[PDB]
Ligand binder design. Structure first.
Ligand SMILES: [Br-]
Ligand SMILES: [Br-]
Ligand SMILES: [Br-]
Lengths: 119, 119, 119
């Protein structure tokens, strides 16, 4: 059934903000220090840029579940119950990710509209 | 290797039935009663409508794995071994879902064909 | 943040090699011997063909994480500790799979470019 509501065709300001996000190829700093430029290329969008094109059109990318934000506490380096080291933990950081399946949807809705030639 | 068969380019009646399905934005009745219209927008397709546009073109959406159906038994409210309540369970219902990765494929095959300008 | 590097718009030789890959409908030999042609149709790309269109344009599909390869040892038929059978195992084989989310990205980047009408 429908466990859904506020149901309707896709906002145009939204589709118009998405049309603003860019596609990139990039390598993960992770892999690259591991295998040098042996590291594979990945293709996709970039959260920080996304959160931005929606900001210009005056929207929030978080509201459409296109983007996530995550933040954390700085976890101890612990030697116990001696001067001995068991684990080396975390420096405080944060990270933006994306919710790819919601991004593909809006992308394909976007490219549906252009093909009707409304852009 | 190929663990595959009945291998061929994509049916045109199929692509023609898919071209029939609509994209929506909606909110989950779940979230909405939780956080009011604080609730995020999600973008996608809607199973019941899908099962329908294929029915008109005379096809079954289930055969291409675009859609799922699920149904269940009504599970007891149980107080044991006293008049005491441990768990409150289920009223019988059903639910249609979608298989999103198969849906994106057909969507992109669809929008490949239009661009050759076969639509 | 960005845990990313070698960051840039998407290679054109790459996009040009991808434009080369075909979409298919097929059934799994698995399902088909199970339920006959009761077996559902699935839509998508085919790894072996992918690895090939990139080879012609002179690229490797593995480098962009579009494709995987997997190979295995031949595991014993074991009856223990008698002439009795417990498990029937594996004949050595291999298998190419795909990494679908990376494939959709490049597909949608591809169909973005054609719509600017650079193809
Ligand atoms: Br990697
Ligand atoms: Br939500
Ligand atoms: Br199946």
């Amino acid at each position: 059934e429908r466990h859904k509501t506020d149901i309707a065709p896709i906002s145009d300001k939204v589709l118009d903000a998405w049309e603003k996000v860019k596609f990139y190829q990039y390598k993960f700093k992770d892999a690259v220090d591991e295998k040098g430029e042996e590291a594979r290329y990945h293709f996709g969008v970039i959260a920080q840029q996304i959160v931005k094109v929606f900001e210009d059109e005056g929207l929030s990318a978080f509201d459409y579940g296109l983007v996530g934000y995550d933040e954390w506490e700085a976890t101890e380096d612990e030697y116990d119950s001696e001067g001995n080291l068991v684990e080396k933990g975390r420096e405080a950081g944060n990270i933006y990710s994306i919710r790819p399946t919601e991004c593909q949807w809006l992308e394909m809705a976007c490219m549906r509209r252009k093909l009707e030639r409304l852009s």
